[PDB]
A paper describes a structure:
(D) Model for RNA duplex binding and unwinding by Mss116. of short duplexes bound to D2 by excluding one RNA strand and bending the other. hydrolysis leads to core re-opening and enzyme turnover in DEAD-box proteins and perhaps other SF1 and SF2 helicases. ‘clamp’ ssRNA and form a highly stable closed-state complex.
A10-RNA + NDP-BeFx, N = A, C, G, or U. However, each base interacts differently in the ATP-binding pocket. base are missing in the structures with CDP- or UDP-BeFx. lower efficiency irrespective of the nucleotide base.
Author numbering: 88 to 96, 101 to 595
The structure:
Amino acid sequence: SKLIHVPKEEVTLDSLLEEGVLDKEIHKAITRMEFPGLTPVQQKTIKPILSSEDHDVIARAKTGTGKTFAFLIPIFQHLINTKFDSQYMVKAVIVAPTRDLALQIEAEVKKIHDMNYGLKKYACVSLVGGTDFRAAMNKMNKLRPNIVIATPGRLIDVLEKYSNKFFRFVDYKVLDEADRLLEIGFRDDLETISGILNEKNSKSADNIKTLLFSATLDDKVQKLANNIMNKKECLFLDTVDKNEPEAHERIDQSVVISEKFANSIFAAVEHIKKQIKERDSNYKAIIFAPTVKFTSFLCSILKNEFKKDLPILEFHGKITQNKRTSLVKRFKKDESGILVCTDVGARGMDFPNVHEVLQIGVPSELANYIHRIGRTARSGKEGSSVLFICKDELPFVRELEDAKNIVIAKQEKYEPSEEIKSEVLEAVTEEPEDISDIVISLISSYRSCIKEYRFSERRILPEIASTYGVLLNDPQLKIPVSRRFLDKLGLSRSPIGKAMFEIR
RNA sequence: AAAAAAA
Ligand SMILES: O=c1ccn([C@@H]2O[C@H](COP(=O)(O)OP(=O)(O)O)[C@@H](O)[C@H]2O)c(=O)[nH]1
Ligand code: BEF
Ligand SMILES: [Mg+2]
């Protein structure tokens, strides 16, 4: 308790200025960006967030509808109307599930800064992994930022060491893409963070206001966050009807269903090839893959196939953070190209004018389907989406309707010609051992979501394994492994293990 | 070994 709902039933910068809620400095900043007008969530979120009363804020809004400024504008306004207290102390802590999203939010704050130098006094520092710790701390000491954007790990590192120095006067903490940060693997980290910030706060352990933002969340998050929500009441600001699908309606969704999993790649290649020809290389797209190794492999194929027409960018968690930042900014700027990536780029990342979102296989989690396709059709723009799967993945499409009420109308089958298989497979440089590691990674990936997506383990896993045979152009062939490895896999008893591997 | 998450 206590969760108060406010379902989706005009607010303007000028009105907010004249009403006295917002200062001229920030009004100048947002007005100079020349947006047509505040998004519904911003209209529905700003004023309640500044309400000093003892209440937390949960906000659900579809993808690409400007949630970032929905909590950045209030933060800045808060910093304005508290400017003579604690000045050189952190007053707002923003947490994101990925480094690039945190750096993106930082860039948005610096975008706010560049539109009005008067707001630069309210400095900002990002705290993420893959960056020099000392340089960040020197930046912390030098700037005395009022806003911190961070990823949980590095934030915890900093908090364990400098909570007293910087974080004793936090008034706001923000969970962007809250639901993922409230999933297993992140919840304990955020509980430690909230605990430290609350423990270290100068006024009270319940002083801090918490903001939860995402395109995908329900009432379950209210329960999942009960330990990090200090205040007594909690506002639910929803710009989506209960039964309405969370997916952005402007996205033209489709699914390509194949007999086997491997030739969904062939399905995608035929799709992209059709797209570069029709659009005359004026094509900007993001293609998602379930795993790093498969991302890299798929990247190698798309490089062999389409490098002559478009840039092919490889984006995943094993890419050095410097290169991640370089390619996100490049793919942010460039007018065309193919971003080949895992779910690291599924949430939050804002790439202007992405034409299509492609998916080979399923996402690491069901909700990430909504966020994946959310990378296109942003800020009023149009967009389409294609899901490339095999028949044994069909239950996932079934799961999309039962839970999230997501109905993919356009569905079609696919069978590859011998020519494309020969052309693609002949142009693979990877040794059988690499193919083995890649397929093994896919087996591991699909095994971890058997329960979630209601897959038939006895059917889907052998199919994933068969990809090894397909790529080596011998469907009868099975993956060569050792007895210890097969035992280590724990399929020593399962017939599927025998059906999918060959102990050589 | 899955996708994230500083060591
Ligand atoms: O008042 C606004 C705020 C947002 N935007 C658009 O929304 C985008 C921001 O999307 P964001 O990622 O911040 O929202 P989210 O994806 O988190 O829902 C900007 O680039 C703008 O094009 C807009 O048109 N008017
Ligand atoms: F949901 Be938005 F893409 F951050
Ligand atoms: Mg966001």
